[PDB]
Amino acid sequence: NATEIRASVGKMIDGIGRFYIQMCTELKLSDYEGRLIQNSLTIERMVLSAFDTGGPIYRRVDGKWRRELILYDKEEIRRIWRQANNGDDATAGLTHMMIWHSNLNDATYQRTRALVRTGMDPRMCSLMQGSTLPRRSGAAGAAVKGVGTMVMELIRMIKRGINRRTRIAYERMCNILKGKFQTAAQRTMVDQVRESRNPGNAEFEDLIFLARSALILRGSVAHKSCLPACVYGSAVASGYDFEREGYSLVGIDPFRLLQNSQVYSLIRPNENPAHKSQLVWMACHSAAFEDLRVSSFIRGTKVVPRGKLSTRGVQIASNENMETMESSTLELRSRYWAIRTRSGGNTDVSFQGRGVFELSDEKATSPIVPSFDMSNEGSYFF
């Protein structure tokens, strides 16, 4: 059923587009200045804040880049937003940029300070997918969460308590948790945890176990290809009418869109452009914990590890100066594409028979199997 699912999500994409365009028209930005992932970000956050303000806005004058610090009527923003979505709320839409931010953060940063202070092993990176993602996120917002993500929550919810309505949360938070697991025991053991009203160290210690079980017997976690507002704004402006032509977040749609995107980014004096593009690209598909081998395979070019990556973050801090600042064009194109999955595999070869698709292969017709016998460069982005 390609009617609701493909076209209803198109309608949520149209909203973000339309809105971004309107909002650019207010700031009186240029074309080059609307394609600046920097400005796009600021706008996206202005909105999520207002639906739950001001921000950094970079301008282009003869030669150099000027940063403007601006503020907007928190309600005006909310007004312009609905205008774009037909006076609807389109929580989906806000939630979408809620993820784009997530997926960018799960790749720009490593959240160790928090894992340990919770009592999780820092080496449990690959399980913290969406730890940044506000609880306000929707139902299809939590499905993107890693097993480890859930644990850090319950453990804190439990840790402060064990140190009214709060109960329905805990059980559900576990049901979700449990719905991540895809094996008998895994599934059953989650229940044995959900049994205690005041679950103390008994649970505290047990879930941590299950956290580690997922390192081997992974769960089902959905991945959503969520592109920056500018990319959708630009697309909408170019005529693409997604609600009518359909769109996906786990199909070929997102890759294809990024095959024509003209996104620019601010880049510090000593940073490596190629390295910058890599980052953004990995946030566009939630590939921050993917096997570097495969990421590079599909990417088309080396996908260098975080340590060897030359960049500190895409957003520009108030500390820095503009004099020594310039901007590059982000390389977001990829070689092939792949069905962003949810499954963690089980039996060691996973996704037996599943392959990669050419960017011409619109339909999921002919699959391609990668052979990794090769001089690779690692598997752990972190």
Binding site: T112, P122, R123, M124, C125, S126, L127, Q129, G146, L215, I216, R218, V221, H223, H285, S286, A287, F289, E290, D291, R293, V294, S295, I298, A338, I339, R340, T341, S343, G344, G345, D348, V349, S350, F351, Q352, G353, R354, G355, V356, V369, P370, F372, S379, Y380, F381, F382
Partner: peptide
């Protein structure tokens, strides 16, 4: 250490999953 130990899979392909 302080590094990764397993790989979270993002795509559907024939891939030995590292841990």
């Amino acid at each position: 250490s302080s590094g990764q130990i397993s790989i979270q899979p993002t795509f559907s392909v024939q891939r030995n999953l590292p841990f």
